[PDB]
Design a protein around this ligand. Structure first.
Ligand code: ZN
Ligand code: ZN
Length: 373
RNA sequence: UGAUUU
């Protein structure tokens, strides 16, 4: 078992180093817990290790490089076969480790690697974004640690003495910010079936209530709105879960959460979202509050369909429009733009669904009527 | 807590 393959770390070492607050000073060591398995995930791993290394000053002693040196020797001592490796790392890799690991994976197709990260290190710096993309392109699967992964790491690698994992405050909030940020910098694209199913604007017939939201940012420069290529991406609502958001978190709120995290300066910005459902009353109230607090940020909301929340949704849309948000129903040009920009389309052009224009006209008339009452 | 990279 893993407990006999590693010396489990002190619980305080784990809790302090794997806390997932995205902005965290004082944590000058990187920790890496790993499992080496066969192609078959069943059974215990072949081996498991804990590595650590100081962030500064020598990247050669970061735990990713210690892992590489260990793994080379270990493979010499065991009969060769394909390996699936999993890492739980407290900080995501620096540019040097990202490139070294990418080189290693690109030269060795017998090894595949999954990296779960507690926090993103310098996620806002383009050299780090680029190096994480290089690592992804070499085949590494990179994900943010969520509750299940912290619990698994606790059970396997920590001297918990039979006590269960206890989540810290704001674990889910931190997770959602980091997962959106990682999707941004890896340039994740939406599945085309997912897009077409969720943005079709005919009367909704599925029992599912889910909201997908694409977003982008423009900056005002010499009276012209210019693109800001950094903060562009998509997200969806978080369904309720007692270990996540117990009452869920709607897509509009996750979107709003991202804007302060971007640390926009004092210039004028226009933030646009393309959401498959118009916001419910709660979401519209929160967006109105945001507008009240961020004068330099102009909000533009394009919706595929109008969501009747069985409540005060019309009042929410009216309040948003009155407070200066642009609210409009998506037309052909917005659907095509989202297909071209946010969707994993693999060179294929946008193919409109039947009735797109007719549905857009009827929805736009309904939105006009709501805004005029 | 925007967080010393040779
Ligand atoms: Zn490193
Ligand atoms: Zn809502």
């Amino acid at each position: 078992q893993i407990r006999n393959m590693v010396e489990p770390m002190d619980p305080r070492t784990f809790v302090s180093n794997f806390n997932n607050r995205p902005i965290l000073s004082g944590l000058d060591t990187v920790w890496l817990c790993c499992e080496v398995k066969t192609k078959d995930p069943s059974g215990p791993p072949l081996d498991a290790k804990i590595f650590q290394g100081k962030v500064y000053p020598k990247a050669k002693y970061h735990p990713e490089m210690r892992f590489l040196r260990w793994f080379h020797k270990w493979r010499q001592l065991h009969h060769d076969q394909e390996y699936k490796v999993t890492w739980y790392v407290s900080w995501s890799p620096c540019t040097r480790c990202a490139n070294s690991v990418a080189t290693f994976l690109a030269k060795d197709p017998k090894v595949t690697l999954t990296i779960f990260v507690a926090r993103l290190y310098y996620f806002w710096k383009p050299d780090y974004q680029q190096a994480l993309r290089i690592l992804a392109e070499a085949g590494a699967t990179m994900k943010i640690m969520n509750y299940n992964e912290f619990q698994d790491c606790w059970n396997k690698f920590v001297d918990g003495r039979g006590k269960p994992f206890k989540p810290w405050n704001n674990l889910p909030k931190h997770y959602t910010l980091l997962q959106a940020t990682l999707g941004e910098l890896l340039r994740h694209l939406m599945d085309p079936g997912t897009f077409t199913s969720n943005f079709n604007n005919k009367p909704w017939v599925s029992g599912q209530h889910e909201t997908y939201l694409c977003y982008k940012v423009e900056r005002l420069h010499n009276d012209t709105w210019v693109p800001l290529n950094q903060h562009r991406g998509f997200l969806r609502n978080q369904a309720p879960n007692i270990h996540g958001f117990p009452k869920g978190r709607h897509a509009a709120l996750c979107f709003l959460d991202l804007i302060p995290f971007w640390k926009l300066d004092g210039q004028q910005y226009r933030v646009t979202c393309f959401t498959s459902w118009s916001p419910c009353f709660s979401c519209a109230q929160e967006m109105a509050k945001f507008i009240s607090n961020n004068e330099h940020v102009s909000l533009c909301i394009f919706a595929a369909r109008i969501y009747d929340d069985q409540g005060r949704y019309q009042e929410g849309l009216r309040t948003l429009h009155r407070d200066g948000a642009k609210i409009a129903m998506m037309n052909y040009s917005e659907f095509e733009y989202c297909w071209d920009t946010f969707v994993d389309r693999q060179g294929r052009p946008f193919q409109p669904w039947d009735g797109l224009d007719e549905h857009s006209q009827a929805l736009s008339g309904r939105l006009r009527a709501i805004l005029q009452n």
